Ligand binder design. Structure first.
Ligand SMILES: CC(C)(C)c1cc(CC2(N)COC2)no1
Ligand SMILES: *[C@@H]1O[C@H](CO)[C@@H](O)[C@H](O)[C@H]1NC(C)=O
Ligand code: NA
Ligand code: NA
Lengths: 11, 28, 251
């Protein structure tokens, strides 16, 4: 449902 | 903050949003 | 938000989205009170009856947003959490008394046209504005109806309700750390917070200095937008000494 956020914020 | 609560796109430019007047009118 | 409308761009630049990392989903609203501090409801982070107890690394905050689901490139900013602070006397067992929490960000967020902090009330602003009939404004990305979800941030203006009416609307024990807001059945107009709006701000624009103040935090309700029910909000001013103690000690 949500657009993927940049990977930098999940690292 | 010194500028807290003053919105860049509203108060800082002296523009009102579409419903803030409803709030003001209730402050009797 | 039930029976609200789409926010204008930059209308609520202190609005924060509390976002779960995995699965990626909206958890709650919140508000920006300085470049490093975000205010929310304690129940957004800790509610043992529902096996909810988030740690810092479980969550992100998204600031400057308008669209609920889009990644708003070049506009929103995403921050990691350094530390969560929950009121030590938050009563999750009974009635959500003292439903307040702070989140310190790992790095300061840059202010912009879309990102700007709200003020917290002083005693005098609270005394003047926290009166039955006076209206505040609630914003959030929560559900549009009790029993669906918005494209963009929603906004509704709602009147504060007399304390005896609040108390007489519910079987829950109401405390001085809560207030309620919403229209009465005989008033015609409608509106309420709903699931997903929790933790977001109830704001009022001071007519004395033309600044926005966060008087409440969306805390709890029984259903959404039911006739004869009201939304309940954490009384920010009553808990401000705790807020200041945390910021002074840990900021
Ligand atoms: C006031 C009581 C009955 C404890 C309450 C709890 C809730 C909803 C939640 N279970 C709190 O986190 C979501 N709404 O009212
Ligand atoms: C919530 O989780 C933290 C981290 O494990 C723990 O220290 C704390 O005791 C928990 N609180 C409750 C009320 O269960
Ligand atoms: Na009652
Ligand atoms: Na109602």
């Amino acid at each position: 449902d949500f657009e993927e956020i940049p990977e930098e914020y999940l690292q | 903050e010194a500028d807290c609560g003053l919105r860049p796109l509203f108060e800082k430019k002296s523009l009102e949003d579409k419903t803030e007047r409803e709030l003001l009118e209730s402050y009797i | 938000i039930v029976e609200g409308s789409d926010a204008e761009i930059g209308m609520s630049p202190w609005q924060v989205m509390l976002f779960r990392k995995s699965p990626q989903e909206l958890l709650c609203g919140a508000s920006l009170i300085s470049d490093r501090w975000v205010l929310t409801a304690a129940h957004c982070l800790l509610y043992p009856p529902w096996d909810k107890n988030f740690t810092e690394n479980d969550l992100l905050v998204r600031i400057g947003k308008h669209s609920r689901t889009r990644y708003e490139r070049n506009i929103e900013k995403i921050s990691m959490l350094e530390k969560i602070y929950i009121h030590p006397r938050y009563n999750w067992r009974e009635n959500l008394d003292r439903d307040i929490a702070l989140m310190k960000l790992k790095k300061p967020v840059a202010f912009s046209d879309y990102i700007h902090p709200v003020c917290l009330p002083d005693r005098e602003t609270a005394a003047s504005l926290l009166q039955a009939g006076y209206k505040g404004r609630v914003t959030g990305w929560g559900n549009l109806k009790e029993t669906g979800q918005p494209s963009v941030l929603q906004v509704v203006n709602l009147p504060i309700v007399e304390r005896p009416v609040c108390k007489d609307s519910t079987r829950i024990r109401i405390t001085d750390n809560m207030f309620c807001a919403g229209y009465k059945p005989d008033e015609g107009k409608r509106g309420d917070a709903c699931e997903g709006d929790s933790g977001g701000p109830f704001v009022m624009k001071s007519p004395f200095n033309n600044r926005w103040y966060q008087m409440g935090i969306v805390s709890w309700g029984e259903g959404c937008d039911r006739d004869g029910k009201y939304g309940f909000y954490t009384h920010v001013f009553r808990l401000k000494k705790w807020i200041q103690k945390v910021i002074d000690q840990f900021g």
